[PDB]
Every structure is written in C-alpha cells, then in structure tokens.
Design a protein around this nucleic acid. Structure first.
Length: 79
DNA sequence: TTTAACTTTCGGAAATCAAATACACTAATATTAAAACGCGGGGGACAGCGCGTACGTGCGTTTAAGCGGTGCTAGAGCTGTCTACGACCAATTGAGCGGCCTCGGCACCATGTGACTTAT
C-alpha cells in the first residue's frame, strides 16, 4: 500500500499547488492512479534503457531519455 | 600530461551549364449541386430554488518520515587482451534476350555411261 502511503494530505497540498481548493475524495485515489500510470511507463522506458546500457543501476540519463522519447523532456539533468 | 589546430593533400561532392520535357495556371463554359436567404420551433439552457451533502473545516491521538548512526557489498566503471566481424574488394557467378548459324530441302544446271546407230 505504498501508493496509499502517498497520503491524502499530500495529494491535497498538490491540489493546492494545482490551484484548486476543493477536490472530491476519489480524486485522491485516481490521482494516485494517474501517478501510477505515468510512473509505470517512464519506469518501463528508463529501466529498459538501463538494461540495454548494461549498467543495471537505473540512471538519470535513462530517466531523461525516457521523458524525452515520451515528449516530456526535462532539463537540468542531461547537462 | 591530453584535447585539439595547425596544416599537406586530394578525389569525391557541389557547384555550374544546358535542353527536354512537362506541368500550372490563367481561362472560357453552360450547367447545376450546393448556398444562403427566410419563418416557425422544440427544445433546451439558463433563471431561481430547497435542502440535502460532501469536502472541507476543526480537534486528539496517533503513526510514519526523517533523520542518525552502522555496516558492507553489490555493482561503477575499468578494465589490458584476445579476437570476429564486418567493411572491401572481386570474382564468381548468372539469365535473358539478341546473333549467328546451320540444319535439310528444295529448284536448277553438269557430267558419264548404256543404248544404238551409223557411217564407219
């Protein structure tokens, strides 16, 4: 239950960075779900990059290449 | 002590020059499929509302998150060394469609000998 360990006050304060103030309860479970989906895919891409690289420790370059292929390219790390 | 820029060259590239298509558009044409004017309409989307509701709003006691030591080891990254493996050359093919030929079969003129005959 690690994704439940991602606590509902946590999801709340994330909503408040998100600019909203009222959020239904099942949003917490389904924001957990969206985090789960994106994490699953980026982990797939980065883990596979890592597996091919033969350094089976998952690397930041693997992560940023995953995000880049996804179109979600992130700065500050591949540099 | 290791990442460059001098160079010293050269042989494929990237210009040029040219003509061979060939395609775009600028354009007549009657038609004629869709445009766009023109009035109701349903239908619906919003005004206004009651009260149920649902996520915050608010307290108590928890829980994990966060440190803060305590290893210890699994890989990081690096192998110093042996190939393999693929990039090159070329030969080592090949098949497909023109080329010669060359088969045999026709029509035509040549040559010798068997009749016979005659004037030897």
């Amino acid at each position: 239950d690690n994704i439940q360990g991602i606590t509902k006050p946590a999801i709340r304060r994330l909503a408040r960075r998100g600019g909203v103030k009222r959020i239904s309860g099942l949003i917490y479970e389904e924001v957990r779900a969206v985090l789960k989906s994106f994490l699953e895919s980026v982990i797939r891409d980065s883990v596979t990059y890592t597996e091919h690289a033969k350094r089976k420790t998952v690397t930041s370059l693997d992560v940023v290449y995953a995000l880049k292929r996804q179109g979600r390219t992130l700065y500050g790390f591949g540099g």
